[PDB]
Amino acid sequence: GLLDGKRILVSGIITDSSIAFHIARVAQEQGAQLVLTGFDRLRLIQRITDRLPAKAPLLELDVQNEEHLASLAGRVTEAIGAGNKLDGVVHAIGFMPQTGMGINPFFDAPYADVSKGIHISAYSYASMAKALLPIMNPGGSIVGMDFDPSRAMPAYNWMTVAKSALESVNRFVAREAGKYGVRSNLVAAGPIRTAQIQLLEEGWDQRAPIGWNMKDATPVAKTVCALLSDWLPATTGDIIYADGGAHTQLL
Amino acid sequence: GLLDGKRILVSGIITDSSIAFHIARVAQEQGAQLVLTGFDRLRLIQRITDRLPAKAPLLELDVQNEEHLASLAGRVTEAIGAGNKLDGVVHAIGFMPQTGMGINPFFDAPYADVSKGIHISAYSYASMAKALLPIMNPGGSIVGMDFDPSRAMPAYNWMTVAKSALESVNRFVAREAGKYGVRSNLVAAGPIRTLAMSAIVGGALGEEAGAQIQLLEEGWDQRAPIGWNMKDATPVAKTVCALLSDWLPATTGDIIYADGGAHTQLL
Amino acid sequence: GLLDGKRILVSGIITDSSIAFHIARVAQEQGAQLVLTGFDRLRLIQRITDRLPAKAPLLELDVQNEEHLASLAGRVTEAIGAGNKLDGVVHAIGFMPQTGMGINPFFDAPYADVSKGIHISAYSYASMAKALLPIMNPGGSIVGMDFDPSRAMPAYNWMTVAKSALESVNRFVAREAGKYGVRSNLVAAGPIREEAGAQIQLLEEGWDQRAPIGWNMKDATPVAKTVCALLSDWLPATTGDIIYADGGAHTQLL
Amino acid sequence: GLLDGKRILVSGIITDSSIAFHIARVAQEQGAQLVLTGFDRLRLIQRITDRLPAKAPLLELDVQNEEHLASLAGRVTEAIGAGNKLDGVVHAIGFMPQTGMGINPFFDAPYADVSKGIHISAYSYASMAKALLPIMNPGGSIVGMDFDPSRAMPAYNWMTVAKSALESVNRFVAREAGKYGVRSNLVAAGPIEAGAQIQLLEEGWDQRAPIGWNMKDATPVAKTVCALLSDWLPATTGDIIYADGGAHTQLL
């Protein structure tokens, strides 16, 4: 097993088609012991986490709640063991209200909404790292999810701003994580099926030399599992691109 | 002149040593008609803008105030003329509370403080563009101030995050500005010795912080092939005035680096 | 004048349509004293340089010839004056044989041809800087021409590789140029005017769509003006960098 | 095994301390069947490759020789089997004469020498891909070695130019490799008046890297190459994976 005898925290599992669900599914197949995180509808989330190959304890974590943080170390240790520590952390949380992304114009999004998105998508990565680093083993790995924000695109708008902030946050999380001997990295994925949206998706498969399947979330789930393993021990504060190679191609 | 017969809005002038003051000073020397922006101390700021080569009207703007942004364009047109429009916009506003940058650890900054910084440093650029684009001429230019956030560095911490957000905002401001035929660009400057920067060197933030900022400034002059003067704010001012002119008409959503070439050098 | 009382060396002025010809035209309008260089057909090049607003001395410069590069500076000083020096240098010589770019597959280009392309497009920038830096004034400027090579595209093939090399060369030229107080920068332009015919069309159409301020493939004056801005004293803190005159297309996905 | 039942071509093995040597060693430990490449001094390479955990056939490949590149595809097939194909390709070839890198000034390197370096370090990657792609399986991987050329540094001079060219070549190799369903990627490694600048670079690298950097250890970069040769990075192409301890993402 690629992740044999590793304790990994996986956050933001809501559906069975999610990359977050597949990361957990692939990790369990590779011999990893998981601890899962639920945002709000925990009863709804428990029905989905039961489709997973092995049993994993579900913990309540509202990334915006301060009390949920700090208690997000004690609650983890009680689930795994008194002397046992975490070997991996998967941050699969990303949100932006519709005012900030979609049909709504860039200028028409109010700050309160874009602030909510930066908190949940970018700040929360530093928050999760602050709470989980004291209970992490040397050689550990924190993985976040990104969508290449280096260039502006239609509809994505303020979520591109939240992603740019995440990239900067990850570089600083790596500095704090390095003193624990833990790696911090981001996984930039291509479009995942969760008029303009069709144009962006079609463009990706054309640009990607090996092509891109918007319906398949296992190639990105495997990329996260490669970063959670000891096969990338010299990679930190970096972005690993699982987009079929589209970002390196103009046409 | 380089900016002859151009109407430019210059924001965030608080001192006489500021890059924002030196933009306005160089612009007036190049034949530009200015409109200046104030935060809270209106009488105190107007008394700092009297040191400028030519006369320029002052206007109240609190980027956090929605009324101040909605009253804009109208208050600008009344200052310049009924049929006259703006040719340039200078966004020289950047803030982050000390919890987010300095000696305070990255993890110890609360969200409310870092949210205040992103609002004032990154979001405000889109807000100023939203309010001023309808009263801007085709071939116009919106200029913002940046500090290279592509790599993490000590003390900067969350201001680096706010700067990364500004870079992304600038790319989207360019899309909206393009519809008016207006350019939107950022100027990435090297370290500038402000009043706060003179204090953190003097030991106001401690011996640990006083070494970090020194190590950064010394390293910048070494990396820059043409060198870098932390005390001189005119080479960055001139770079902004090149972007406000018609000599860079095919540059949009981009970052122009006035750091002595340090960002392209490892050692 | 933006370039008033400045002595600038301009290279690669073969045709009247060239950005190199426009750079010289705009520079002369801004009060600059030029020194021009030709590749081989100096008789035909002199009939082209006669269409420039002001008079400028012609010089023979085969950038592949070592004797021609060693002969530079002396030949330049004799044209301008014994005590006078150069304030600007515009490198506008980019080449790649058709085996390296176009319809011909990437793998089918022989090394001898791509080597010729790297020599003329990338290495020559360092060579021109080596020869002209001792006769350049502090606050001077060396400007090169680029086309964004950060992402692979059809037809450009090995010329994209030669451009990537030029970007790296520019960063090292800046180190040597800094010692003289001279700046070194590149200008990345947008596209300038059946299978190949469709590819280039798809690229040009896409560029005007991506560019928020739009892009005119027929107009070479916005890129010429960008070079002139870099030749002036209005960008004195910019070195080893790439200034993008592409309408903002490189910062836009769609 | 991470590379179980995979046939991988490993080029440029000259010493028992090389990353190329450690890539081959780690791959054999992960269950991979190797085919090795030797430049000229075959008696020296055979001695070094004997120290490897398992047996692997040695093939002669002067990457500058056209006949060697044209006959390579068949010579690999004869070593593995008449019906078998390659699953991985490791390009561990990088050279630049001392005129192009070291104490010698940037301007003083003649073109003939820098041309030799671009041929061996950047062009050869496209040449090796041209020769080996027809005998490669879908889901395959071509891996090259890089040293971050995005910023200029002392001494590395013209080799930084050859590396920038490799990065551009890699993006185009990905286009050709994609047609075969093969991935093409580069691994940017950290360091593995002369001494006064190399020391200042190595010391600075361990300081910048948040997890630190060991200039004496070549196994973390060898493991990174083996991760790219596996099926755990199937959506990565024309990209650069950085095994430098995270130094490239840090200013100080």
Ligand SMILES: CC/C(C)=C1\OC(=O)[C@H](C)[C@H](O)[C@H](Cc2cccnc2)NC(=O)[C@@H](NC(=O)c2ncccc2O)[C@@H](C)OC1=O
């Ligand atoms: C076209 C504008 C909209 C309305 C969205 O954007 C997309 O669908 C884009 C084109 C992409 O398909 C991305 C692909 C993706 C998926 C997961 C993580 N990073 C990127 N989706 C999200 O960012 C989506 N991200 C996540 O839900 C997310 N999930 C796990 C971890 C981090 C996340 O940002 C979401 C915010 O975006 C959208 O639904």
Ligand SMILES: CC/C(C)=C1\OC(=O)[C@H](C)[C@H](O)[C@H](Cc2cccnc2)NC(=O)[C@@H](NC(=O)c2ncccc2O)[C@@H](C)OC1=O
């Ligand atoms: C980590 C050390 C501290 C304590 C600071 O950061 C600095 O002093 C950095 C190293 C630089 O000196 C920069 C220089 C600079 C100044 C204005 C625009 N771009 C760059 N300062 C600011 O960005 C400073 N901001 C501005 O003054 C600013 N002014 C006009 C427009 C945008 C700005 O961010 C501010 C963040 O600097 C600091 O207080």
Ligand SMILES: CC/C(C)=C1\OC(=O)[C@H](C)[C@H](O)[C@H](Cc2cccnc2)NC(=O)[C@@H](NC(=O)c2ncccc2O)[C@@H](C)OC1=O
């Ligand atoms: C792939 C299609 C072909 C067949 C060519 O490429 C183009 O037309 C590309 C897509 C662009 O239109 C660029 C636009 C350009 C032109 C001059 C300087 N920077 C950018 N052309 C060259 O690079 C062209 N270069 C120059 O003329 C050039 N001129 C002065 C200095 C350096 C140069 O590369 C040349 C390589 O372009 C082509 O022949």
Ligand SMILES: CC/C(C)=C1\OC(=O)[C@H](C)[C@H](O)[C@H](Cc2cccnc2)NC(=O)[C@@H](NC(=O)c2ncccc2O)[C@@H](C)OC1=O
């Ligand atoms: C200090 C200045 C000199 C004189 C050299 O540069 C170094 O030793 C630098 C600082 C690094 O140690 C790098 C690290 C490295 C090692 C292998 C592949 N990419 C990067 N070595 C080379 O590039 C070295 N290249 C390789 O060993 C190499 N090996 C396999 C595949 C590609 C390569 O370039 C070589 C060019 O470096 C040097 O001889």
